[PDB]
Amino acid sequence: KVLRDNIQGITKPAIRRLARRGGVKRISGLIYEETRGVLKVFLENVIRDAVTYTEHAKRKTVTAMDVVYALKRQGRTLYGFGG
């Protein structure tokens, strides 16, 4: 019945550690998969905005500055940065 998913990617130890860094000592099995998913979605959101900026500048290279502009639009995470 029980089954182990295959993953090439973020390993369980790092996920348990991010959770712990949040004060969460114990996490379910589905939390690993969720954390990978949510991480992917967040990165997609940021990169989508960053590339919008990169294309507006007519570059092919996403810069750190593109990433900052994008990150500031993602809500609380970078809120307040730079002023």
Binding site: G23, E34, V38, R48, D49, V68, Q74, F81, G83
Partner: protein, 205 residues
């Protein structure tokens, strides 16, 4: 006091590591480079570790502490209860050094019960529980704030150090702003969708 000549040499080396880190930071990685264990990103990470070790050794040489002036180093006081024993124990709990200091409710409650029992304060169980919940809330706010500030005051690099929000290109370009708005509506939906996905999975199991 450390050898002046050796401090000078180590500081020149430190500056060299910094120059190379700045060089690596500006490297543009294509998609195949992002698949590479020897990429400039990983070279840069390893060089940062090397640098931090050297900084540590220079701190040995000058008999200084290892402190860098991080926001998370600054102590968070807690006076929140009417029992200073409890208050001290809570200050202790929340002021442990490191990126990982974030208690859960159980930790707070354990600190409260421990200070109680230790000092024989005669506090009953529901008073203890209420004290712990109020405390946990307080320290939660302070810890989250300290991390947020540590992040935003320590973010990025020389390439982003001139950032200011008033320079956002989107402010002067309505087409760009419109596309970003559209993106934002999509982003919010995608995040809700992944959160819901894993909740649903938890239920169906």
């Amino acid at each position: 006091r450390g050898s002046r000549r050796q401090i000078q040499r180590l500081e020149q080396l430190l500056a060299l590591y910094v120059a190379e880190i700045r060089r690596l930071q500006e490297k543009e990685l294509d998609l195949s480079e992002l698949d590479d264990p020897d990429s400039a990103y990983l070279q840069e990470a390893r060089l940062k570790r090397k640098l931090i070790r050297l900084f540590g050794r220079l701190c040995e040489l000058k008999d200084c502490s290892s402190l860098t002036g991080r926001v998370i180093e600054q102590r968070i006081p807690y006076r929140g209860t009417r029992y200073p024993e409890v208050n001290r124990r809570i200050e202790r709990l929340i002021n442990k050094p490191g990126p990982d200091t974030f208690p859960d409710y159980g930790d707070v409650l354990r600190a409260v019960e421990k200070a109680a029992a230790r000092h024989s304060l005669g506090l009953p169980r529901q008073q203890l529980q209420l004290m712990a919940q109020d405390a946990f809330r307080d320290v939660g706010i302070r810890l989250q704030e300290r991390r947020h500030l540590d992040l935003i005051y320590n973010f990025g690099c020389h390439l982003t150090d001139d950032y200011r929000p008033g320079v956002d290109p989107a402010l002067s370009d309505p087409v760009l702003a419109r596309r970003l708005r559209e993106n934002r509506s999509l982003a919010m939906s995608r995040l809700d969708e992944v959160i819901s996905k894993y909740a649903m999975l938890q239920d169906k199991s």
